Amino acid sequence: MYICGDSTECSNLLLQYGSFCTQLNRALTGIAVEQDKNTQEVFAQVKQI
């Protein structure tokens, strides 16, 4: 959507490239999961409330 805004004639051209979009999505999902894990690990030390 960022690179080829709702244009099939552009998505087709993008598909001729590699798996760059999948790689970027993987990286950003990993970043988000890492941030959630950091927040969980810093505060949820003791589980009893």
Binding site: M1, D6, N25, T29
Partner: protein, 49 residues
């Protein structure tokens, strides 16, 4: 099945995954222009000697 497609595997482990988008397709098409009726004077440039 879409998750299986984007994950490139026949078995999906437990978790939450991101698949495609939900881009809303337009219902129909509108075109708006000023109501200019006079044809452009192309006879004074083409039909000239």
């Amino acid at each position: 099945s879409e998750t299986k497609c984007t994950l490139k595997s026949f078995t999906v482990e437990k978790g939450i995954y991101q698949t495609s988008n939900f881009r809303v397709q337009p219902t129909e098409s509108i075109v708006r222009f000023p109501n200019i009726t006079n044809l452009c004077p192309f006879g004074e440039v083409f039909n000239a000697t």
